Design a protein around this ligand. Sequence first.
Ligand SMILES: Nc1ccn([C@H]2C[C@H](O)[C@@H](COP(=O)(O)OP(=O)(O)OP(=O)(O)O)O2)c(=O)n1
Ligand SMILES: [Mg+2]
Length: 426
Amino acid sequence: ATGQDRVVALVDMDCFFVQVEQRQNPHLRNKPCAVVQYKSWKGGGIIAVSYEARAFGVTRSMWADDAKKLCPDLLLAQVRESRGKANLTKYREASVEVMEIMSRFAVIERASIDEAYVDLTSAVQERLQKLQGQPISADLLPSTYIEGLPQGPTEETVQKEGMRKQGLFQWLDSLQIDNLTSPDLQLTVGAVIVEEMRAAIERETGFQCSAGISHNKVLAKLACGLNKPNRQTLVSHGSVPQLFSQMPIRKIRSLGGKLGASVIEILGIEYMGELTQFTESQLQSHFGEKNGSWLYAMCRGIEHDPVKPRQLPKTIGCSKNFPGKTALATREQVQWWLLQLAQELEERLTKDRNDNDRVATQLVVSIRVQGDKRLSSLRRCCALTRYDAHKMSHDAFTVIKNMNTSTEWSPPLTMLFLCATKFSAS
DNA sequence: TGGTCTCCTCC
DNA sequence: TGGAGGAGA
Ligand SMILES: Nc1ccn([C@H]2C[C@H](O)[C@@H](COP(=O)(O)OP(=O)(O)OP(=O)(O)O)O2)c(=O)n1
Ligand SMILES: [Mg+2]
């Protein structure tokens, strides 16, 4: 198998939170700007950065005071604060706009707030039967890059738009259109549809996005990041060997952490391509049966993880960190914040019930204690029977009350997390 | 480092 | 009728 059975796209919103704030406030459009939370501490922590601001070296998690040193004219929008904490409602509602448009075209898997995988196989087939064997014009692909192209010989390729076009021209001239079963053709038609999905998103919301088109989710996701912002990339099966030959392992989705580090360390390699020299059994012996098989196929551009038909979140939660000296040290402090979180949760749950005809049946409560390395010190669950903040906050307190070893609380709490899960039809 | 989150696997 | 952790938005 060559892993060419599907056409898969991944659509990803450009500097998402920034665009949401720029739509609402025209003064921020086409300028260096960032989205911050909690203005009183070092100007706020940056959570999203415009491309104009990135050119100055501004990144996520920079304090805005520090970002102003790199970019003096940097403009800022603040996350809404409600019930004593950052509130992301605006961005979740903006997300809904985008997901709904995309779901008119095909089955989506909502992977995050601002990205969805699209399974385009069927849409591609139908379109190929509609076209009537007609040639594909370059005008149908005005923002598409073909990864690996242009190659060979040929005052045009000096500028980026010039390169894109020569690349696209070479691809289209070489396309055999008379055969409806050609994976390259399928991908091309898949890219035509994504141009239309992206045009629809921009028309109906004003947000711009990037997209990757390939044969699986991982290559689609890799493809998408190759030409940002506001552009889409086709990564064909044939492009993989050259692409993978200098592709750092950590750039592939799910290899950005400890597992990716172990591949590099154990095998003595740098690049995704280098993985081809190892047998499936060799990879299985190092990283386990599932990862080993996954890597064997992946380094050859083959992956089988399906686009799951799901556009609603499986969990609805909210949390607050209480770092250093702000750590919660009294029973009444703990009960107060549990109530704030519960109240926001109640509102979001109630909305979710009316919107999507479903109820959460489990409440998960998670905490961190001061001086614990781990990201969580304790997760406990209970039944969620009523969408009632007072009940949910009191029940949350019950199940964690045993952690106190002192009405003082010790050790102090650095984190609270309430999460509603286990949805069933209502 | 940061902060408010979601999805997944392992045992 | 679970809880810890990894990996990413
Ligand atoms: N660690 C993170 C990552 C993301 N986000 C939020 C803010 C982002 O705008 C949105 C989407 O995340 P992306 O990783 O897609 O980043 P952007 O959309 O901001 O930039 P890009 O244009 O590179 O996708 O999720 C966040 O709060 N914290
Ligand atoms: Mg994005």
